[PDB]
């Protein structure tokens, strides 16, 4: 029989519009989301132009409203110049994203003083998330403590990182974190097959001991999120490959396979792709919205999934059990068996729903 799930939420996607529409756009990426059982996405701001000011946010909002097929919220990006300038639009974003390490972005903040400035000026009731690797996790936690507020750590990939977060939680610090499927299901053992172009990702793939540490410490992981980071194969295999993997269409099948193997429970999945995303990002419910999955269907991930313009996947050849059969989004059939059935523009900005505003003290 099928299993009906609530509408799942991916709090970490790169939809490339505006500026990189050859790699993906709102319409292609949201189709990929629906095919992966995802009905709500939070889009990162490392676009061109980057979403680091009110005019760029307004542009992105209209592009998303015209192109998205599922519902969404848009992150604002911290820059070396915009601390203290975001207060009037902060409430309309998913949250504030800080890039603290080298990756596919122009927004790296060089000085910890700039991190402090953002933590002090961004509204304290609104989410802050960080790309923060290895010791950078400890550094940004220290900034969060100094400014007495929470922080969310994106794509945790290392034993070192999950143990540090575990220690912080044991001391009662307000830290949450997410893990991406490639850091649960791929490792150094896969770099031979992938090669140095396809295999380029930040955070980098970890050792078998890193992967085992994440599974052993699943209780520490608040969310799963894809860090869907599409680039074309030509870009991945070029001289200077951008880091990142596409992942919306493979995330849920990989995790369902783990459920079928007893590696985690259905509830574990629903906490990490629905309940905790809702509560960490204050995201609203979606009325008359659900995902029907088939837990029996065995298949092999092909060389590319149907919808992402990335047109490749690092999970090619992996055997999975579990597939998305049907998605209903706000009372309309949005996806069935490889066919997306809602048009670009069906999706809405959840921060403009009355239930989507983040409550705050007057």
Q: Rounded to an integer, what distance in angstroms lies between the CA atom of residue 184 and that of residue 214?
A: 7
178 binds Zn ion (CB under 5 A): no
Residue with the CB atom nearest Zn ion in the bound state = 131
Q: Are 158 and 177 in contact (CB under 8 A)?
A: no
227 binds Zn ion (CB under 5 A): yes
Give min distance, CB of 248 to Zn ion, in A: 12
* Closer residue to Zn ion in complex, CB, 157/293: 157
Active site residue: 10, 210, 222, 227, which one? 227
23, 97, 131, 274: residue in contact with Zn ion (rule CB under 5 A): 131
Give min distance, CB of 44 to Zn ion, in A: 5
161 binds Zn ion (CB under 5 A): no
What residues numbered 240-299 form the site for Zn ion, per CB under 5 A?
none
Kindly report the number of other CB atoms within 10 A of residue 290's CB atom: 16
Contact stretch for Zn ion (CB under 5 A) within 123-131, 157-165, 180-188, 208-216: 123-131
What residues numbered 42-71 form the site for Zn ion, per CB under 5 A?
44
Contact stretch for Zn ion (CB under 5 A) within 34-42, 114-122, 222-230, 286-294: 222-230
* Closer residue to Zn ion in complex, CB, 210/227: 227
Q: Is 222 a catalytic residue?
A: no
* Closer residue to Zn ion in complex, CB, 117/178: 178
* Closer residue to Zn ion in complex, CB, 10/71: 10
Q: Which residues pair with 252 in a beta bridge?
A: none
Q: Are 226 and 12 in contact (CB under 8 A)?
A: yes
* Closer residue to Zn ion in complex, CB, 140/328: 140
Q: Are 43 and 13 in contact (CB under 8 A)?
A: yes
Q: Rounded to an integer, what distance in angstroms lies between the CA atom of residue 244 and that of residue 49?
A: 19
Rounded (10°) angle between helices 159-170 and 135-146: 20
Where do we find the tokens 């059969």? 325
Specify the long-range contacts of residues 276-279, CB closer than 8 Å, at least 24 apart: 276/176, 276/222, 276/223, 277/9, 277/10, 277/11, 277/223, 277/225, 278/9
Q: How many residues does the chain have?
A: 362
End-to-end CA distance of the chain: give it in Å, rounded: 49
24 binds Zn ion (CB under 5 A): no
Question: Would you list which residues are annotated within the binding site?
Answer: 12, 14, 16, 46, 97, 131, 154-155, 178, 202, 227, 231, 243
Instruction: Using CB under 5 A, list all residues that contact Zn ion.
Output: 44, 131, 227
Residues with catalytic roles: 227
């Amino acid at each position: 029989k099928l299993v009906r799930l609530p509408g799942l939420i991916d709090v970490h996607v790169h939809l490339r519009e505006p500026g990189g529409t050859h790699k993906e756009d709102f319409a292609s990426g949201t189709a990929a989301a629906l095919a992966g059982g995802i009905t709500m996405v939070c889009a990162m701001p490392n676009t061109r132009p980057p979403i680091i000011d009110a005019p760029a946010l307004a542009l992105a909002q209209k592009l998303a409203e015209a192109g998205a097929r599922c519902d969404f919220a848009l992150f604002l990006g911290a820059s070396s110049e915009n601390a203290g300038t975001l207060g009037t639009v902060a409430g309309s974003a998913a949250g504030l994203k800080l890039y603290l390490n080298e990756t596919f972005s122009e927004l790296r903040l060089d000085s910890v003083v700039q991190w402090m400035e953002h933590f002090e000026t961004w509204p304290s009731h609104l989410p802050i998330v960080a790309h923060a690797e290895q010791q950078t996790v400890a550094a940004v936690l220290m900034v969060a403590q100094l400014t007495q507020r929470s922080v969310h750590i994106c794509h945790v990939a290392r034993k070192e990182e999950i143990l540090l977060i575990k220690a912080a939680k044991a001391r009662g610090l307000p830290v949450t974190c997410e893990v991406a499927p490639h850091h649960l299901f791929l490792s150094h053992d896969d770099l031979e097959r992938l090669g140095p172009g396809k295999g380029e990702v930040r955070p980098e793939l970890g050792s078998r001991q890193d992967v085992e540490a994440l599974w052993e410490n699943m209780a520490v992981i608040d969310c799963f999120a894809s860090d869907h980071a599409p680039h074309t194969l030509e870009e991945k295999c070029g001289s200077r490959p951008p880091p990142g993997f596409p992942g919306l269409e493979t995330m849920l099948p990989l995790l369902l396979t783990a459920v079928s193997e007893g590696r985690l429970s259905l509830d574990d999945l629903l906490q990490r792709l629905h309940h905790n995303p809702r509560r960490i990002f204050h995201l609203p419910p979606q009325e008359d919205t659900y995902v029907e999955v088939d837990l029996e269907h065995e298949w092999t991930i092909p060389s590319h999934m149907p919808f992402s313009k990335a047109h490749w996947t690092p999970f090619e050849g992996q055997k999975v059990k579990g597939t998305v059969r049907r998605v209903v989004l706000r009372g309309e059939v949005a996806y069935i068996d490889g066919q997306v059935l809602v048009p670009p523009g069906y999706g809405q900005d959840v921060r403009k729903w009355p239930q989507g505003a983040v409550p705050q003290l007057p």
